[PDB]
Scaffold this active site. Structure first.
Site, PDB file in Angstrom:
ATOM      1  N   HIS A 155      39.444  30.840  43.511  1.00  0.00           N
ATOM      2  CA  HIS A 155      40.521  30.572  43.677  1.00  0.00           C
ATOM      3  C   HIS A 155      41.532  31.545  43.966  1.00  0.00           C
ATOM      4  O   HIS A 155      41.109  32.611  44.957  1.00  0.00           O
ATOM      5  CB  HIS A 155      40.462  31.708  41.898  1.00  0.00           C
ATOM      6  CG  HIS A 155      41.732  31.240  40.974  1.00  0.00           C
ATOM      7  ND1 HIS A 155      42.242  31.787  41.079  1.00  0.00           N
ATOM      8  CD2 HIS A 155      41.733  29.791  40.262  1.00  0.00           C
ATOM      9  CE1 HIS A 155      43.654  31.133  40.284  1.00  0.00           C
ATOM     10  NE2 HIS A 155      43.523  29.925  39.605  1.00  0.00           N
ATOM     11  N   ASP A 194      37.861  48.762  44.335  1.00  0.00           N
ATOM     12  CA  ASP A 194      37.643  49.313  43.141  1.00  0.00           C
ATOM     13  C   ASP A 194      37.201  50.770  43.436  1.00  0.00           C
ATOM     14  O   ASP A 194      37.353  52.017  42.669  1.00  0.00           O
ATOM     15  CB  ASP A 194      36.526  48.304  42.352  1.00  0.00           C
ATOM     16  CG  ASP A 194      37.039  46.942  42.315  1.00  0.00           C
ATOM     17  OD1 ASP A 194      37.888  47.196  41.850  1.00  0.00           O
ATOM     18  OD2 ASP A 194      36.687  46.156  42.087  1.00  0.00           O
ATOM     19  N   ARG A 249      31.199  38.108  33.168  1.00  0.00           N
ATOM     20  CA  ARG A 249      32.027  37.311  32.682  1.00  0.00           C
ATOM     21  C   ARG A 249      32.664  36.168  33.399  1.00  0.00           C
ATOM     22  O   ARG A 249      33.245  34.888  33.011  1.00  0.00           O
ATOM     23  CB  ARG A 249      33.708  37.637  33.175  1.00  0.00           C
ATOM     24  CG  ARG A 249      34.608  39.198  32.155  1.00  0.00           C
ATOM     25  CD  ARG A 249      35.355  39.576  32.316  1.00  0.00           C
ATOM     26  NE  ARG A 249      34.524  40.032  33.772  1.00  0.00           N
ATOM     27  CZ  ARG A 249      35.904  41.346  34.104  1.00  0.00           C
ATOM     28  NH1 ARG A 249      37.287  41.314  33.336  1.00  0.00           N
ATOM     29  NH2 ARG A 249      35.508  41.599  35.600  1.00  0.00           N
TER      30      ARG A 249
HETATM   31  N1  LIG Z   1      47.083  40.208  39.319  1.00  0.00           N
HETATM   32  C1  LIG Z   1      46.870  39.056  38.858  1.00  0.00           C
HETATM   33  N2  LIG Z   1      45.825  38.718  38.257  1.00  0.00           N
HETATM   34  C2  LIG Z   1      45.676  36.819  38.042  1.00  0.00           C
HETATM   35  C3  LIG Z   1      46.777  36.656  37.646  1.00  0.00           C
HETATM   36  N3  LIG Z   1      46.708  35.407  37.115  1.00  0.00           N
HETATM   37  C4  LIG Z   1      45.112  35.479  36.952  1.00  0.00           C
HETATM   38  N4  LIG Z   1      44.481  36.868  37.435  1.00  0.00           N
HETATM   39  C5  LIG Z   1      43.324  36.956  36.676  1.00  0.00           C
HETATM   40  C6  LIG Z   1      42.530  37.174  38.350  1.00  0.00           C
HETATM   41  C7  LIG Z   1      41.209  38.229  37.993  1.00  0.00           C
HETATM   42  O1  LIG Z   1      40.409  37.563  37.773  1.00  0.00           O
HETATM   43  C8  LIG Z   1      41.053  38.364  36.708  1.00  0.00           C
HETATM   44  C9  LIG Z   1      41.451  39.736  36.013  1.00  0.00           C
HETATM   45  O2  LIG Z   1      39.750  40.168  36.211  1.00  0.00           O
HETATM   46  P1  LIG Z   1      39.714  41.629  36.643  1.00  0.00           P
HETATM   47  O3  LIG Z   1      40.603  42.285  36.958  1.00  0.00           O
HETATM   48  O4  LIG Z   1      38.276  41.903  37.000  1.00  0.00           O
HETATM   49  O5  LIG Z   1      39.682  42.363  34.580  1.00  0.00           O
HETATM   50  O6  LIG Z   1      42.990  38.117  36.121  1.00  0.00           O
HETATM   51  C10 LIG Z   1      47.505  36.815  38.440  1.00  0.00           C
HETATM   52  O7  LIG Z   1      49.497  36.816  38.467  1.00  0.00           O
HETATM   53  N5  LIG Z   1      47.906  38.274  38.861  1.00  0.00           N
END
Ligand SMILES: Nc1nc2c(ncn2[C@H]2C[C@H](O)[C@@H](COP(=O)(O)O)O2)c(=O)[nH]1
Ligand SMILES: Nc1nc2c(ncn2[C@H]2C[C@H](O)[C@@H](COP(=O)(O)O)O2)c(=O)[nH]1
Ligand SMILES: [Mg+2]
Ligand SMILES: [Mg+2]
Lengths: 241, 231
Positions: A206, A15, A68
């Site tokens: 996850h 990040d 979150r």
């Molecule tokens: N890159 C990505 N993130 C995913 C997918 N499915 C669910 N997410 C989730 C992972 C993270 O917990 C989230 C976005 O969170 P954040 O980047 O911290 O705002 O969305 C996917 O297929 N790709």
């Protein structure tokens, strides 16, 4: 324009790299989970509409001064309802394979077969519902795993196609969390950069919290020191491209 | 899966090249103009139902035993209604920027401004309406020039990503006509292969592959096999 996909577990220094790049270069960013968060913020406002439930906005789904991981104390029924509104929203951005949206006067609903997979997937999740779990569920548990594995890469492609031709030096995708997103990235000629903290892990089981495989051609920045040491590694990695 | 965009003028041998590849390898093909003919075949079926017009299926829109130069004798008016139904069909595939489709009880129509731009654009077309002029009007006079320069390439992107883990060795897009579309193909990681004859065309940029069709078919064929070899 140079397309860069970043990869790194939580707190690895990924990040920091993203922000270093966004503030030191001409770069435009695109978040794969962008639309996941927009759909949930939209679904939420439809759900908590005329309720006494707290108002969560896109900013909160973005995590801006909001944890979150906060339990939202929701029932599986509430969660299914929200997922159905999130689907109706997304379907208007790009059609989800096998999903149809029907209207009954400003009341949108998905087709039974789709509604039925949402229900089955949600019913089997025993975790507590946080903004984080709802993102994981919408993104992966439902869409990638049961409707279209490439949906989030498809929305990135529509965005990129609108912007590849502009005046930015870099186009960054900072949140790659699935191997198939990395696969698409490599296929399109993206530079893939992994930011790695020597022997560290993700405290979320996850699949989207897991460290992505480093394949040949991928660049790796080892975050094994100081901050300027990281900032130097970033500068010399980009100078090369 | 290797993404290949083919480029070449009429009779350059570009079409023979697409054919040979399709016939000799695990390859899948996508036409940028596919959705254009599908939308018109859809819009057509819907409008010529009410009328005493010829029945054109997706098969004749493909030029399958039909001359697409054939004048259809249409009012700028019917052409405008055909065009709005086609926008309705396309919008269901991928939203066209600034277009909204609404249902009017067994009758979807596009928002007014989209509707107004369509009329304005179709009103300056001083030509005669063949199936082939309809494809251009939909494809270029309207969408590319007035709504989204990149819309046909966005639809290919959706299909390509969809076939991403399908097992084909090659994905071939044979009908690119615009340079901005070739720029987008290059931005998505495609290999651009131009098929040219010794003594209009799209520019040959650095990195593009060039096959000079200067001999026989078997020589053309041999050049294709060796080019695919080093991709
Ligand atoms: N890159 C990505 N993130 C995913 C997918 N499915 C669910 N997410 C989730 C992972 C993270 O917990 C989230 C976005 O969170 P954040 O980047 O911290 O705002 O969305 C996917 O297929 N790709
Ligand atoms: N590739 C491509 N074809 C287009 C575009 N706009 C219109 N076309 C149409 C016009 C041509 O007559 C037609 C080719 O159809 P066909 O003969 O079936 O290959 O493609 C566009 O933006 N890109
Ligand atoms: Mg809705
Ligand atoms: Mg229609």
């Amino acid at each position: 324009m140079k397309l860069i996909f970043l990869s790194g577990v939580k707190r690895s220094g990924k990040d920091t790299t993203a922000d270093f790049i966004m503030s030191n270069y001409s770069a435009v960013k695109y978040q794969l989970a962008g639309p996941i968060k927009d759909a949930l913020a939209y679904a939420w406002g439809v759900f908590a509409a005329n309720t006494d439930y707290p108002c969560l906005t896109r900013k909160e789904f973005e995590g801006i001064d909001y944890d979150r991981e906060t339990n939202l104390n929701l029932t599986k029924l509430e969660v299914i309802t929200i997922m159905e509104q999130a689907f109706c929203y997304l379907n208007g951005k790009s059609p989800i394979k096998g999903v149809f949206v029907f209207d009954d006067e400003g009341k949108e609903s998905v087709n039974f077969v789709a509604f039925n997979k949402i229900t089955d997937v949600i019913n089997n999740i025993e975790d507590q519902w946080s903004v984080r779990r709802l993102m994981q569920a919408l993104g992966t548990d439902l869409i990638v795993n049961n409707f279209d594995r490439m949906y989030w890469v498809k929305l990135f492609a529509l965005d990129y196609l609108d912007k590849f031709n502009s005046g930015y030096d870099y186009y960054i995708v900072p949140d790659t969390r699935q191997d198939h997103e990395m696969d698409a990235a490599r296929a399109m000629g993206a530079t893939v950069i992994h930011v790695v903290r020597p022997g560290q892990k993700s405290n979320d089981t996850h699949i989207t919290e897991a460290g992505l495989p480093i394949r040949d051609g991928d660049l790796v920045i080892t975050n094994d020191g100081s901050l300027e040491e990281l900032f130097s590694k970033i500068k010399n990695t980009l100078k090369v491209l």
